[model samples]
Target: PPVKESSFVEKMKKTGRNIIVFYGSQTGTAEEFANRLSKDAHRYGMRGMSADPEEYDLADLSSLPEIDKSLVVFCMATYGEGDPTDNAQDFYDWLQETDVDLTGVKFAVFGLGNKTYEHFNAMGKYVDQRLEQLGAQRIFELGLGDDDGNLEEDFITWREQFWPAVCEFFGVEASSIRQYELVVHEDMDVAKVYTGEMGRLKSYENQKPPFDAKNPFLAAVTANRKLNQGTERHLMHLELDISDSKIRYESGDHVAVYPANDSALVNQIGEILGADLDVIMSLNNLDEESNKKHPFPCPTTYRTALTYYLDITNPPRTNVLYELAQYASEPSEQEHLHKMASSSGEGKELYLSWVVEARRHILAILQDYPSLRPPIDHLCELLPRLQARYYSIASSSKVHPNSVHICAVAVEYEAKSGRVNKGVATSWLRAKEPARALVPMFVRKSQFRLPFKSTTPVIMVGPGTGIAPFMGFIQERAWLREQGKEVGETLLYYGCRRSDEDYLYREELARFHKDGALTQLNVAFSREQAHKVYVQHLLKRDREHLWKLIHEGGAHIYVCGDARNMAKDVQNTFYDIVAEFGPMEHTQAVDYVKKLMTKGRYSLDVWS
Candidate 1:
């Protein structure tokens, strides 16, 4: 039988469309990539559209066969240790459980992940293999983009090769699409542009407070204090009021904060693009049926976009080097630019050393590549949308019923380029002024829960800000004890540089211990002695005790913090303990901990 077009394909075919890109994304990166792909496909005379994976039903994992040279594509991001993003969980679950026939389906995959995780690009790997197992057809090899360090370059490389594959598969011409055209919103009241609601939260402002990410409430900060006394890194105790906002959160959830760019940096982008901040801007179509979506939220001024919409601060990548090279009128400059953008270029090495590792921004790009001046649209197209930073909720809702708390290290580093780098949200929180302090925020459920049974024993291993979640666990336990509930043993293994310097929430921890809420408290001050000690060390020192709790007593273990190392070391420590106390072989000890992790006896809330 010949390949048949599915209903979606038939509908698109009627309109001369070739593809509809589906994406499962959090933080907008994957969404942006999917849209970019859609636009890129158009240059080959193949029209495309982008859809959120959550909006469609994909029950069969089949029906993707191409009849008129069209295809279905999935671009997905794996969030936090191989878990599907919240929006795509249903589709992901369905794909995992369902059985389907895809003997003629045509499809492809692009995965975005951070290599810092154990299961890097886990979602992409799982889906691609499963689809293959279920007899789905693939048009291209799996394209994976890593974000641990090489996000910008990784995306461009994957995209560069990816489109060529798409063109070859469809037998279409290949070239870059005209991605942007300026809209002339003539004489349409430019006075209120910045003050207007078009590109901002104007409509949501002064509204009743059922707030979320789409509509964030300007929660007032009631407290700002420092945790580190002498350490160069400063951990902040930031508290915000959610009382009138009708917002709610539990202990283990996370808070997402939308931050703005530095006013200083925004001005520099306008200069680089040769566009005045006052320029009234919106997007226009290149043809009869170009993708109608604007890359960024617009019909607004450059000032607003620069300040609140796009991230102008990531270092230049290979695509950027090439894109800007097009406008380099000087022959020498063009050759230099082209060469540096190549895979084997000396300037590329210099870029990695001076620009990338130094945490250079958009402003630095033009300075280094002096002959280049990319159009504002290209700048906008290349720059990623401003994304919110998530902080682990540090206070139990039971303890602080109407407010949320955060413990963050204020990141202010110096670049070799003579520009000081400041963390956007952290700096904003530090210099929290009264009027503009209505920080856009929302709660994200982490699903890090304490054992519901009061008699269930628990052990926590957390270092530094990883201590955030465990604080809530302790607070909740203390609250339960206050209610006269007979709770089980609670053990906390905490590590910091110095007890006098950065030991956080110490008064509360001491009080919890005194109140008999904390069964055992072990502390390691890494700088308090010559031989540095960490939580992993303490875990081994008390191996006999912890081993008994897991093997004999039904105790659960929770690890939070840096996924790259701290959690890994502690897990290995568990293996050591199991081996030391039990008569199990080395492999069995590893399997024992692995089984615990699978059974939810051990859980983690970790990040790169």
Candidate 2:
């Protein structure tokens, strides 16, 4: 049994580990990075472990240097608006104390953030700076990983240099050894195997409350429909019955739906790997004292593992490439894989062209390199966990308390490899038959919310499927108005390719407008003319009117859509309006917008 040590320093001593990697994660990316770093630490003849900062008392952080050649690494990911992740908030707060002293703590920091966000990698920056201020020895330059562009590559580039620096500083040698052992359980009882259960054995069948990411509720599908009339693109509106699970949600909340890999893709992977999909197996940590039994629930069939456990369709990370290279039978293919995994210019270019741009997956790689044959268990261990997809809830809780709604655009695009790539979750949701299928899902709360006061004016900017949450907002307002409450003056600026083809919920919007629940309906049909007209353009056209509502009426602004371009453009448009309409300078306008954000008058629910 693992030692029952509460203190992280004590646990480190008990486990004979010198390096500890702490992760602040929201969607498990930072956790994965921390584990990867821990595994990499073994190469330098050091025992390493990964810990969630929230799980242990970190008051002993100052005493970390007492352990032999000890080092601490932070794999911190910035959450919404440059805030520390939920699990790391306590640690973040503790570190803010000015009197904290750390004379000899050695540390390194890597931040995961989307460059599209205004405060990109802010959490990482703060931690790195604060650590140095507390008298900690800086082991390496802070690594800023941009999630917007090739975060994995950025990590690889940083880590490749980082490891060498550590080795030089610690006077350590480099080598590698197996960390986990794959055990096959032959003739395993069929009833004992984990077919598709995400949590405890048979948890899904038994059904439980307080459902979340780990233990999802199997909500039955109530409604599913296509929104577009004749467009080649697909947009789906899905409703799930959450009455049995007692899951509650607000209009602005998100629903995380677990999706399975395409059966065809799963089949091809098993075929290429020569894995008997029915075989039951588990990958166990080599250290006997380690408490973790497996990466996920084990004693599971390969078929179940491939379909429900692992991420096989996404682009293979550089670490996956490194692992695959060892299993390549042909010397040339092995060398080729190794080169593509390298940080060299030629290698990076080759990888970007062949893997990244092509959106190649593990199955595709195996097909491309027939000589590569790794054990199915090892392959499964190498792949990252299949993550759930989050979509904004599109139904008002007041209208349908026991149900959840989703508005999703089924994504598919032709890659440079000439192969069509499809969104895993959207495609799965599209195939689900209403009234028959059960979708595993849970609600994720958000700060994006409506104003408390009913009389406060509101402005919404949502283009394409971004109208999801606004649908709920309008529904709630209409319901409130029916209850004899005075609803706010609501304005919506929406855009699509064409009014007839992809104008989602046109009839509903018109009805809401007619009922006076929606004060204004500003539509922008981009393809109606040769010149494209987006919501930003409409906001500019109605600048003076908007300024009157914003300045005098005190309207709360909400923008939801693509964070890549739309959100930025719309925000900049607001800045321009604030400056020009107010006759204020750029800097003054910027400060005004900042004030709006601080006061919760301006909110964004955008995504990349």
Candidate 3:
């Protein structure tokens, strides 16, 4: 990995940039927000750019006091359990421990967080407070974006007020012009050009070990098949050969799979843009000292870039619409785009209806406005980077050491506009054939895991595809039993629509239960009974057993599934069980659960 030798302050001075927006992002959302803020700073007649906090020494922040009109901006995202993101850990530590008197530093903070978690925007709140405690003057009030709700709208609302404050403080008027230098490399050698390579050139073909998110190993698809019998949806079971990768993961770890956009979608974008898809090109930042030479891979054709690098299928951000409006030739189209990107009442309403509700992607928007033809390179620069999708590892390493397995539900739904929209990663995974397709993937360690002691009982609540990690857990336990080790009580609560429709791994689960690997198998079929019976409802019914396993047996509780409803409901039910069984107050029951979480007895691997 390349490390920055020069300080961020020096780079800012060299680039003639007064503002630096630093991002601590895990999944690119906060980074995108940082870049949006950086670009928006140009509208205030201030030159600025976004920087990853990991790339530079934040100790140099004190030097910002010396630079005229210098400002520091933070777009931070709180990771799991209110912790700082991986990239921001060092900075967070420094700020907490250092006595660096930032008496004159001017700063602003915007935190991206999911409210479903206990500590919403904790990192953002921390940074905002710490900066003040250290004497750094806040330019505006801290902005917190709830990922569970309308994060985009939250950002837009905050930014609308933030700009005026910035302009007033700087005594500058806001402008609307921002431009980048685009380079068309018409004669670049085909072999030399970046053709969907990640990290280093030809990294995949070279095939190196120590693969990760930056550079993933290409694992062969050994098994790919539908697990569900119903036609209403697809529940896929896939196995990848990681034998040669020298990668290892635990039962509850996550697998990050890199996926490419549909070929037809890529072709459509190229046709709509009226560009030669095969021609090599790159966009150059005017700042010579800037580390970002290209938005994604450089010296690559538009075809390859669209297919592998850029995200064009998701709903286009309002910031993207703001850029698109500038290039629109038609007056009404330009006006409409501008309005949708605005923070006005009509604009918000229109955006919600046309973009959010309709699920309109960049291609769909382009098709809607025929006269809006923005430069492809500019559009690429505006678009957020395509990121890998992560799924719970469904097979234990002890049982299948050379392979990794995943249980996924392919997402395909018709939007309010009547257009078919599919999940980029799930759609790609579902299309692969066994023994022929190769998946670029890596392992991501997670906090969700079985207890270290084989004798410790475990209560697992996972419904639908949530049963993924529990499969690995049971497999590892079964393997341990086969090796003549003492395996304790393993209770599993799994639910689906019906046992005959989407009961995933029915045979395997039955076999595991019969072999005494799984002590108790509580299956809830929601549609089979007169009333819907979810996993949470089943937990409520088995309150006595749950209390015994949890309180007396010192069992670890694990919840893996959807965060929106299932996880919340399950947790609430657990609280109810503790209150009713312990004969304790509701507050004490809540504290008990919290204590369990603090002691690593309760774990969750849920997703929105």
Best by lDDT: 3
lDDT, each prediction: 0.76, 0.87, 0.89
List residue ranges in candidate 1 displaced over 4 A: 1-11, 42-47, 59-66, 149-177, 184-201, 272-274, 284-292, 330-351, 433-436
Better of 2 and 3 by lDDT: 3
- Give the alpha carbon lDDT tens digit for every residue of 437-530 in model 2: 9999999889888889888888999999999999999999889889888877889999999989999999999999987989899999999999
Q: Please state every model's RMSD to the true fold in angstroms.
A: 4.0, 2.1, 1.6
Model 3: lDDT equals 0.89
Give the Cα-based TM-score of candidate 1 against the true structure: 0.90
- Rank candidates, TM-score, best first: 3, 2, 1
Ranking by lDDT: 3, 2, 1
Q: Model 3 over residues 1-608: C-alpha lDDT tens digits?
A: 34755788888887788999999999899998988888888777898889998888888989997889889999999997888997898889989898888988999999999899988999999999999899899999999999887789999999889889999998988734444567888667777788887788888778898999888999999999899998999999999999879999999999998898999988988888987788788767666667787788887888888888989888888888977898899999998888886776888888888988899888889988888998787788788888889999999999999999999999999987568998999999999998569899999888988989999999999999999999999999999999999988999999999989999999999999999999999999999979999998889988999899899999999999898899889988999999999989989999999899999999999887
Off by over 4 Å in 3: 1-4, 175-179
- Checking candidate 1 for backbone clashes, the offending pairs are none
What TM-score does prediction 2 earn? 0.97
Residue 294 lDDT in candidate 3: 74
> 363, model 2: CA deviation in Å?
0.7
Model 1 score (lDDT): 0.76
The candidate, 1 or 3, that scores higher on lDDT is 3
